[PDB]
Design a protein around this nucleic acid. Structure first.
Lengths: 201, 203
DNA sequence: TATTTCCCGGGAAATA
DNA sequence: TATTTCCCGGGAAATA
């Protein structure tokens, strides 16, 4: 038995997220408030270190979330015969892909250090000179926008669509609107066009 | 160029490269390809600060395969690269990461479904994908081996191979595969070329 | 391994 | 090199 952070636990990832009745949870939380915690939750380790995935006791975990405890008693499971092999597969599938700005910084360094042409770099990476150029352009964008690219909140084309505005204040404005209204790039491109007619008036 | 045999014990991973994670099965799969035909693409290394010790530049995967095969020696190409060159070679490789082919993913999905007795829905949930995306990959496993190789060798795209499935006859599919390559057909054309061949099945 | 339809961002050709 | 244009396969919603 181990006490683990309530924030570290996530529901069973293969199953759909369960939705419990507030009354049934309150009814369970009142059973914990009276008699205490009686059965610890069962979890395992995720790909990340500080993070656990719930196997059993999702109901009890939710009860202690509402009771606002920082810690929850838990039983860790150390499975290998299948788990470790499958975790290797799922990780080999969900390979961590570098963001536009990450690549842009990588391209910038490679061009500075080894005095390469964009053509030369594009050749090596099996890409078009224009693809390299349009990534490097993103480096001129405001740091808030660059973070949104990294945090994968927006796509490359989203950030590219902001470049024409040229004014950092106008860009960070739309960035928040893109996220809040979940705008696609086609919408984002139009939203820019319309703001460059408000620049005329 | 020049190939030389060096001690497996003398080689260390690329400093600037992040600590790689390889599947024991994928390594064993490579080691068994070396054990059978007795041929390896030689690793690229350089000399360290110490003598008789080499630092790996490329081919960490192949080096690991020969470690498990328990050979004392590994064919290698020495390069006089500076800490900057070595670091940039690590970057360019970290950029041009080998992305898994449709068939590779299909085989991965099939195993994951066999192992954990999961639904396609369940797997799709875990991988953050749509049930249909999982289904349509697994479908490719029914295609002729020539077509499956073309996917792997990246001669055609997933959607190309998917478009062949309706031509339920393996002979008709391998026919179009060659036509897709020869005429450099996109998927839209390949879909039409199939429709037209299912009116030649009527005639 | 169920299949069809089709929207949309990657990314490169065209262009400056 | 930097910028504009826009085609097309990934991949998921819909599934006469």
């Amino acid at each position: 038995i181990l006490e683990i952070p309530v924030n570290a636990i996530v529901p069973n990832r293969f199953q759909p997220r369960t939705i419990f009745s507030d009354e049934k949870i309150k009814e369970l939380a009142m059973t914990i408030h009276t008699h205490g915690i009686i059965q610890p939750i069962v979890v395992r380790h995720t790909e990340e270190e500080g993070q656990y995935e719930l196997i059993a006791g999702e109901r009890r975990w939710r009860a202690v979330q509402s009771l606002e405890w920082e810690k929850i008693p838990a039983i860790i499971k150390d499975f290998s015969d299948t788990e470790t092999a499958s975790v290797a597969l799922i990780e080999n599938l969900q390979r961590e892909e570098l963001s536009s700005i990450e690549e842009a910084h990588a391209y910038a360094r490679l061009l500075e250090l080894h005095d390469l042409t964009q053509e030369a770099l594009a050749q090596r990476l099996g890409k078009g000179q224009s693809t390299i150029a349009n990534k490097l352009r993103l480096l001129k964008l405001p740091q808030p926008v660059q973070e949104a690219i990294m945090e994968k909140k927006i796509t490359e084309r989203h950030a590219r669509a902001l470049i024409p505005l040229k004014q950092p204040e106008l860009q960070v404005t739309l960035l928040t609107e893109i996220i809040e209204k979940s705008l696609n790039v086609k919408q984002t491109e139009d939203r820019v066009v319309k703001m460059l007619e408000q620049g005329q008036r």
